[PDB]
Design a protein around this motif. Structure first.
Motif, PDB file in Angstrom:
ATOM      1  N   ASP A 198      -8.621   7.013  -0.554  1.00 14.84           N
ATOM      2  CA  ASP A 198      -8.489   7.654   0.864  1.00 14.84           C
ATOM      3  C   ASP A 198      -7.263   8.262   1.243  1.00 14.84           C
ATOM      4  O   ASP A 198      -7.195   9.278   1.748  1.00 14.84           O
ATOM      5  CB  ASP A 198      -8.804   6.500   2.070  1.00 14.84           C
ATOM      6  N   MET A 199      -6.074   7.793   1.070  1.00 15.01           N
ATOM      7  CA  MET A 199      -4.943   8.330   1.041  1.00 15.01           C
ATOM      8  C   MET A 199      -4.735   9.542   0.436  1.00 15.01           C
ATOM      9  O   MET A 199      -4.246  10.378   0.999  1.00 15.01           O
ATOM     10  CB  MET A 199      -3.773   7.301   0.447  1.00 15.01           C
ATOM     11  N   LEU A 200      -5.105   9.709  -0.783  1.00 17.13           N
ATOM     12  CA  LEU A 200      -5.079  10.987  -1.418  1.00 17.13           C
ATOM     13  C   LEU A 200      -5.668  12.055  -0.556  1.00 17.13           C
ATOM     14  O   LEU A 200      -5.137  13.268  -0.282  1.00 17.13           O
ATOM     15  CB  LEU A 200      -5.558  10.933  -2.896  1.00 17.13           C
ATOM     16  N   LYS A 201      -6.972  11.609  -0.090  1.00 17.03           N
ATOM     17  CA  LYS A 201      -7.777  12.569   0.485  1.00 17.03           C
ATOM     18  C   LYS A 201      -7.155  12.891   1.923  1.00 17.03           C
ATOM     19  O   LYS A 201      -6.928  13.994   2.390  1.00 17.03           O
ATOM     20  CB  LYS A 201      -9.202  11.999   0.855  1.00 17.03           C
ATOM     21  N   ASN A 202      -6.889  11.824   2.751  1.00 15.70           N
ATOM     22  CA  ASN A 202      -6.164  12.107   4.145  1.00 15.70           C
ATOM     23  C   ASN A 202      -4.837  13.010   3.945  1.00 15.70           C
ATOM     24  O   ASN A 202      -4.546  13.224   5.384  1.00 15.70           O
ATOM     25  CB  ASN A 202      -6.346  10.504   4.800  1.00 15.70           C
ATOM     26  N   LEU A 203      -4.029  12.346   3.052  1.00 18.63           N
ATOM     27  CA  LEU A 203      -2.918  13.162   2.954  1.00 18.63           C
ATOM     28  C   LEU A 203      -2.851  14.594   2.444  1.00 18.63           C
ATOM     29  O   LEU A 203      -1.898  15.491   2.655  1.00 18.63           O
ATOM     30  CB  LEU A 203      -1.853  12.235   2.314  1.00 18.63           C
ATOM     31  N   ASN A 204      -3.789  14.752   1.763  1.00 16.18           N
ATOM     32  CA  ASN A 204      -3.988  15.816   0.880  1.00 16.18           C
ATOM     33  C   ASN A 204      -3.243  16.311  -0.079  1.00 16.18           C
ATOM     34  O   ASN A 204      -2.074  16.884  -0.191  1.00 16.18           O
ATOM     35  CB  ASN A 204      -4.010  17.196   2.009  1.00 16.18           C
ATOM     36  N   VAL A 205      -3.243  15.298  -1.129  1.00 17.53           N
ATOM     37  CA  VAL A 205      -1.958  15.290  -2.035  1.00 17.53           C
ATOM     38  C   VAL A 205      -2.911  14.814  -3.438  1.00 17.53           C
ATOM     39  O   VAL A 205      -3.817  14.060  -3.368  1.00 17.53           O
ATOM     40  CB  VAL A 205      -0.815  14.318  -2.000  1.00 17.53           C
ATOM     41  N   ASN A 206      -2.171  15.100  -4.709  1.00 18.28           N
ATOM     42  CA  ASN A 206      -2.632  14.493  -5.964  1.00 18.28           C
ATOM     43  C   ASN A 206      -1.883  13.532  -6.194  1.00 18.28           C
ATOM     44  O   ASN A 206      -0.659  13.247  -5.702  1.00 18.28           O
ATOM     45  CB  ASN A 206      -2.496  15.745  -7.073  1.00 18.28           C
ATOM     46  N   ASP A 207      -2.360  12.592  -7.024  1.00 22.60           N
ATOM     47  CA  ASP A 207      -1.715  11.435  -7.777  1.00 22.60           C
ATOM     48  C   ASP A 207      -0.774  11.677  -8.633  1.00 22.60           C
ATOM     49  O   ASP A 207      -0.856  12.913  -8.898  1.00 22.60           O
ATOM     50  CB  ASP A 207      -2.654  10.384  -8.359  1.00 22.60           C
ATOM     51  N   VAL A 208       0.215  11.201  -8.817  1.00 20.50           N
ATOM     52  CA  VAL A 208       1.345  11.427  -9.528  1.00 20.50           C
ATOM     53  C   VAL A 208       1.490  10.559 -10.767  1.00 20.50           C
ATOM     54  O   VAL A 208       0.607   9.584 -10.925  1.00 20.50           O
ATOM     55  CB  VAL A 208       2.711  11.598  -8.731  1.00 20.50           C
ATOM     56  N   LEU A 209       2.429  10.592 -11.692  1.00 21.74           N
ATOM     57  CA  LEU A 209       2.679   9.789 -12.739  1.00 21.74           C
ATOM     58  C   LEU A 209       3.785   8.677 -12.433  1.00 21.74           C
ATOM     59  O   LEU A 209       4.705   8.961 -11.732  1.00 21.74           O
ATOM     60  CB  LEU A 209       3.151  10.725 -14.001  1.00 21.74           C
ATOM     61  N   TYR A 210       3.817   7.646 -13.198  1.00 15.22           N
ATOM     62  CA  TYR A 210       4.389   6.594 -12.653  1.00 15.22           C
ATOM     63  C   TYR A 210       5.386   6.032 -13.760  1.00 15.22           C
ATOM     64  O   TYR A 210       5.156   6.204 -14.799  1.00 15.22           O
ATOM     65  CB  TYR A 210       3.527   5.476 -12.086  1.00 15.22           C
ATOM     66  N   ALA A 211       6.743   5.555 -13.148  1.00 10.57           N
ATOM     67  CA  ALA A 211       7.599   5.078 -14.346  1.00 10.57           C
ATOM     68  C   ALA A 211       8.296   3.800 -13.601  1.00 10.57           C
ATOM     69  O   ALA A 211       8.181   3.525 -12.346  1.00 10.57           O
ATOM     70  CB  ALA A 211       8.451   6.128 -14.660  1.00 10.57           C
ATOM     71  N   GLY A 212       8.844   2.941 -14.734  1.00 10.79           N
ATOM     72  CA  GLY A 212       9.628   1.893 -14.065  1.00 10.79           C
ATOM     73  C   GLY A 212       8.799   0.745 -13.562  1.00 10.79           C
ATOM     74  O   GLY A 212       7.739   0.390 -14.078  1.00 10.79           O
ATOM     75  N   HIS A 213       9.275  -0.040 -12.600  1.00  6.77           N
ATOM     76  CA  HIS A 213       8.474  -1.174 -12.040  1.00  6.77           C
ATOM     77  C   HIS A 213       7.169  -0.751 -11.558  1.00  6.77           C
ATOM     78  O   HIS A 213       6.737  -0.080 -10.937  1.00  6.77           O
ATOM     79  CB  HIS A 213       9.261  -2.021 -11.154  1.00  6.77           C
ATOM     80  N   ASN A 214       6.146  -2.044 -11.505  1.00  3.77           N
ATOM     81  CA  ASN A 214       4.848  -1.782 -11.159  1.00  3.77           C
ATOM     82  C   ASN A 214       4.609  -2.200  -9.717  1.00  3.77           C
ATOM     83  O   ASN A 214       3.387  -2.344  -9.591  1.00  3.77           O
ATOM     84  CB  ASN A 214       3.951  -2.215 -12.140  1.00  3.77           C
ATOM     85  N   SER A 215       5.711  -2.598  -9.036  1.00  5.30           N
ATOM     86  CA  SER A 215       5.463  -2.733  -7.414  1.00  5.30           C
ATOM     87  C   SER A 215       6.683  -2.302  -6.801  1.00  5.30           C
ATOM     88  O   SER A 215       7.644  -2.000  -7.342  1.00  5.30           O
ATOM     89  CB  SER A 215       5.360  -4.233  -7.301  1.00  5.30           C
ATOM     90  N   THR A 216       6.767  -2.042  -5.581  1.00  2.00           N
ATOM     91  CA  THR A 216       7.761  -1.584  -4.503  1.00  2.00           C
ATOM     92  C   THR A 216       8.052  -2.786  -3.747  1.00  2.00           C
ATOM     93  O   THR A 216       9.236  -2.911  -3.101  1.00  2.00           O
ATOM     94  CB  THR A 216       7.409  -0.247  -4.017  1.00  2.00           C
ATOM     95  N   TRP A 217       7.108  -3.760  -3.303  1.00  4.02           N
ATOM     96  CA  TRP A 217       7.419  -4.848  -2.631  1.00  4.02           C
ATOM     97  C   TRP A 217       6.950  -6.069  -3.287  1.00  4.02           C
ATOM     98  O   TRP A 217       5.851  -6.258  -3.348  1.00  4.02           O
ATOM     99  CB  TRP A 217       6.643  -4.640  -1.471  1.00  4.02           C
ATOM    100  N   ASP A 218       8.006  -6.740  -3.753  1.00  3.72           N
ATOM    101  CA  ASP A 218       7.735  -7.780  -4.706  1.00  3.72           C
ATOM    102  C   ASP A 218       8.501  -9.080  -4.536  1.00  3.72           C
ATOM    103  O   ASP A 218       9.546  -9.239  -4.852  1.00  3.72           O
ATOM    104  CB  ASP A 218       8.413  -7.251  -6.246  1.00  3.72           C
TER     105      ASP A 218
END
Ligand SMILES: [Ca+2]
Ligand SMILES: [Ca+2]
Ligand SMILES: [Cl-]
Ligand SMILES: [Cl-]
Length: 289
Positions: A198-218
């Protein structure tokens, strides 16, 4: 292509929370490695006026072009849109700092929100930045969290609409489709959930590639999050994306940085507490590899 950092810095009001090491973390962030060598930097939750202006000074030398903090007042901005109210105690917490000059800067307070949980000027900050002759766009924002106090399912719906507010702004601002539009911040939608699509649709953006840690709030590796919710689930909530209808960077990447500062401590009532993080969120770096 730009290099950016986005970071929710947990700078709560020292009036309501006098012992969360606000000023000292502002110095520790200024001295970190992740904060260096980027073009742009987005901050969220820089709420406490005094500690926020310190953090801004601490980076003024590498990032001289700065916006005010969202929702603090009407001055310093080329424009002010949405439900801006000047009665409210806490401000928006969002600001942007740039290595390159800011041609235009606009603040927008979300019209969609919750009526009870918190009087806040949450929204987004727009900036038009000139780099190598060309123009580049950066929006920083911080949407409705799950730490709600509002109805079951309402936060998700609020976010949905807060994001529609951003993409429509992008749409009707009519930006050259050969100029890249970065949209980033603490978006408060967990990765791999149905809401993510939904976020991708509502914001109008594509997903990106990820690196490093697998969470931002941990709460499992972040000392501050661990104290607040020791049994909370690790989530991925901070992102930097680009508008899918404007110029795409080569290969956009989000890298979750887990740099930790030398431990800092504080005394509250009878007790003593140690921590070694800049915030309860981890910073994210973004670049086109
Ligand atoms: Ca927070
Ligand atoms: Ca949050
Ligand atoms: Cl406190
Ligand atoms: Cl504490």
């Amino acid at each position: 292509d730009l290099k950016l950092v986005s970071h929710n810095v947990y700078m709560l009001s020292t009036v309501l929370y006098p012992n969360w090491g606000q000023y000292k973390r502002a110095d520790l962030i200024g001295q970190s490695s992740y904060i260096k060598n980027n073009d742009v930097v987005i901050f969220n939750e820089a709420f406490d006026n005094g500690a926020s202006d310190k953090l801004l000074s601490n980076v003024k030398k590498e990032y001289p072009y700065q916006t005010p903090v969202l929702g603090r007042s009407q001055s310093g901005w080329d424009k002010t849109e949405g439900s801006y109210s000047s009665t409210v105690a806490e401000d928006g917490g969002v600001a942007i700092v740039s290595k390159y000059p800011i041609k235009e800067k606009i603040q927008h307070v979300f019209k969609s929100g919750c009526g009870f949980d918190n009087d806040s000027n949450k929204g987004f900050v727009y900036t038009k930045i000139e780099k190598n002759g060309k123009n580049v766009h950066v929006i920083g924002t911080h949407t409705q969290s799950e730490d709600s106090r509002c109805g079951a399912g309402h936060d998700r719906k609020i976010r949905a609409e807060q994001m529609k507010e951003i993409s429509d702004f992008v749409k009707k601002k009519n930006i050259p489709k050969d100029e890249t539009v970065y949209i980033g911040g603490d978006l408060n939608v967990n990765k791999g959930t149905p809401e993510f699509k939904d976020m991708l649709k509502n914001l109008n953006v594509n997903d990106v590639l990820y690196a490093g840690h697998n969470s931002t709030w941990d709460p499992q590796s972040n000392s501050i999050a661990k104290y607040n919710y020791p049994n909370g689930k690790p989530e991925h909530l901070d992102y930097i994306f680009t508008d899918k209808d404007h110029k795409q960077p080569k290969q956009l990447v989000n890298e979750v940085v887990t740099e930790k500062p030398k431990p800092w401590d504080v005394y509250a009532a009878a007790y003593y507490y140690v921590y070694n993080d800049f915030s309860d969120h981890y910073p994210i770096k973004a670049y086109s590899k």
